[PDB]
Write a protein that binds this ligand. Structure first.
Ligand code: ATP
Ligand code: ATP
Lengths: 277, 277
């Protein structure tokens, strides 16, 4: 408990649990004031026969942001969370949105934590430019492979990928999974500065067959929430646990029912060991 | 606990607690799957020096709805909740959105409850056409005065206003307040059909000086939630209590901090007597 304000910039769907709908409830459950910017407002996520809706233009984004800036809302965000954007100009514009906030915050001696979930064209080049400004990044193995140039097959390659992120400026790197078969392994790598020694942690979670929509979005939201007063390694463990229990709860590519299981999001009971290397 | 699906059609702001942001969290806290349609996506509510953002056009609404309809999402809403729309064509279109859902539901022998918060031009005429389809309406005194043609000054006039709503087809009418000075009085009036006797209830809540944004939006959301398994009179009492406690909690035109007080939304402790007349 402290300043729990988040600007969350992600997709929005009317039906299903992805993007800002998936992120906002877990955050609010943990006491966070979430200011949302919906980069798209669609009918649903991919998977269905049909998808429709509105996609935010650069003009619309800029215009929204005029109000947000003019009314001094930028000074009051302790966190920025980005998810699915898929627009070169806007992900390109977020570099600016981030930079306006950080300077506003630093001038009043308050902190800012930018958590970038690099959800993935020319969008890749734009992410390569944005990720260096992140305090925490949460790539899946595919996104880590694309950004770093290193195919993330296993722990060793995951570590080389994570080094790329530290080299471009990122302190905290979570590579959320890679697949001995009946488990998924993750890597957390932390390097608190150029002249700072890197420490790595790894752990596993049981693999469950099938696909589950919105897992990455809920993970990032829980990571933010748990990172507020838990050390990062503990926060990663609790986030992995939330997902592990939610994926099991829906076993009784389909939705996670987070709303049906709020105590799981608040207080996961499954223990995930995030073990130092 | 039962089918807790809601299609909620209201405004959305990035900053502040109004519209769909104000409604969605209380509903989710009570276990509801909320499918949101954001009729506008603005930077903030009225009150600030500047307001900016996007307003949904008829074309956009229709296009969104194509996806929602095509994917058979309409059949799975137990509730429809409407709030701030302010667009003749769209509030005009909601008549259709409502009618598609009701027939889909009736054909599978399931129920539908439409709660209309008639937030208020040519918009008035359009509401006069939409309100007859509502199961529950939640006008403030101004909106009851505008719709009915009767100035709602006191209990007697509130009752004549409520009669207008029953006459055009509405079973459950809540006139949320009118101002002996240190209290606000409300009226709940129920008439379960043309050939059904009207019953009325009234109660009071302590008046608190100042303005508080989003009270109507949170009230309607809590009413829906509490109406699910409580009788309506009890549900009105609990909703009035939630607001009464939230307005007191922010005393320690400014925001209600619902996220800071989730147990108040789930389990209000203040008792509001909804007394039969
Ligand atoms: N069967 C599963 N599918 C997806 N995620 C799982 C599964 N089982 C466990 N998880 C947990 O969910 C977390 C997020 O999964 P992943 O790394 O695939 O993100 P993602 O691919 O972005 O997910 P999504 O695309 O669904 O948002 C993983 O770190 C993992 O611990
Ligand atoms: N000082 C107050 N201001 C507003 N609402 C209050 C106040 N004190 C108690 N309330 C409760 O809040 C409920 C909603 O208020 P009201 O009927 O004014 O809706 P509204 O005018 O639509 O509010 P808003 O415009 O803020 O959404 C009332 O029924 C009342 O019981």
């Amino acid at each position: 408990m402290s300043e729990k304000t988040v600007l969350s910039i992600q997709s929005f769907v009317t039906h299903g649990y992805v993007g800002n709908k998936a992120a906002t409830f877990p955050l609010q459950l943990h006491g966070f004031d979430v200011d949302g910017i919906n980069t798209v407002c669609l009918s649903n996520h991919s998977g269905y026969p049909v998808i429709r809706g509105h996609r935010m233009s650069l003009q619309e984004y800029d215009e929204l942001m005029e109000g947000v800036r003019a009314n001094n809302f930028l000074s009051n965000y302790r966190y920025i969370l980005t998810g699915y954007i898929n627009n070169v100009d806007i992900i390109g514009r977020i570099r600016d949105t981030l930079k306006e906030v950080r300077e506003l915050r630093e001038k009043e001696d308050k902190k800012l934590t930018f958590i970038c979930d690099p959800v993935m064209k020319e969008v890749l080049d734009a992410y390569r430019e944005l990720v260096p400004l992140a305090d925490i990044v949460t790539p899946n193995y595919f996104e880590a492979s694309l950004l770093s140039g290193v195919t993330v097959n296993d722990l060793s390659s995951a570590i080389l990928a994570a080094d790329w992120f530290h080299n471009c400026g990122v302190a905290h790197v979570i590579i959320k999974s890679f697949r001995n078969p009946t488990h998924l392994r993750f890597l957390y790598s932390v390097k608190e500065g150029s002249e700072a020694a890197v420490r790595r942690f790894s752990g596993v979670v049981p693999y469950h067959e099938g696909r589950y929509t919105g897992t990455g979005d809920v993970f990032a939201a829980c990571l933010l929430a748990f990172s507020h007063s838990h050390p990062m390694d503990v926060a990663i463990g609790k986030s992995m646990a939330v997902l592990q229990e939610l994926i099991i709860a829906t076993r009784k590519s389909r939705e996670l029912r987070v709303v049906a299981s709020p105590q799981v999001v608040l207080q996961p009971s499954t223990v995930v060991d995030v073990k130092p290397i």
